[PDB]
Design a binder for this molecule. Structure first.
Ligand code: NA
Ligand code: NA
Lengths: 118, 113
């Protein structure tokens, strides 16, 4: 498996971002948000949040954690295409921690399904 | 950011696997397991489990699930280099679902942190 194939095959949603815009993403991200990849490419993350205020609020929460630690993870409520609200675990690392919301790699996982415990 | 850089930058552990052996992994996987990437490259997943018995048991759990659904996720106890046990969320997708433990992409995230 090469790196491009891994990105597209990954069982979690992946995004290559820049300034809170999705520059590339995989099919899993599309699945989570109930749309096509084409719907997400060049889309602001803002549309994935329950509201504009939420996008703003969580951005102000992301910055200092990302700067201070160099990575970020949380659980939050997000919005599927068509409006359904759901819980999503999100992780991210900025290419430069002092530019936390610039280029980075972000992960998304739907927490709707019951967690399998082995 | 290209796909190679993304793999290496990712805030979760990532593995490209074949037949339950790590073929490539990122520094985050090394960070979770408190080791170097060179310690993990070419290593059986077995070394990451609490025991050989757990490696065997969970493999038997993964196979039919991966085949039935085309992906896999669970939480399980794993073991850092040096022996510290911790809860780890793992997800995986096989390149071919009917070859569930052959080539695949696997993710690891420490639930204690
Ligand atoms: Na960004
Ligand atoms: Na494998």
């Amino acid at each position: 498996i090469d790196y491009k194939t891994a990105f597209h095959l990954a069982p979690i949603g992946l995004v290559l971002s820049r300034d809170r815009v999705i520059e590339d993403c995989n099919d899993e991200l599309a699945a989570i948000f109930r749309c096509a990849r084409a719907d997400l490419i060049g889309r602001s993350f803002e549309v994935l949040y329950p509201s504009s205020d939420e996008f703003e609020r969580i951005g102000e929460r992301i910055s200092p954690v990302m700067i201070a630690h160099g990575s970020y993870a949380d659980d939050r409520i997000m919005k599927r295409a068509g409006g359904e609200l759901f819980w999503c675990h999100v992780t991210g690392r900025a290419l430069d921690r002092t530019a936390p919301l610039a280029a980075g790699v972000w992960t998304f996982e739907d927490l709707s399904a019951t967690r399998r415990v082995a």
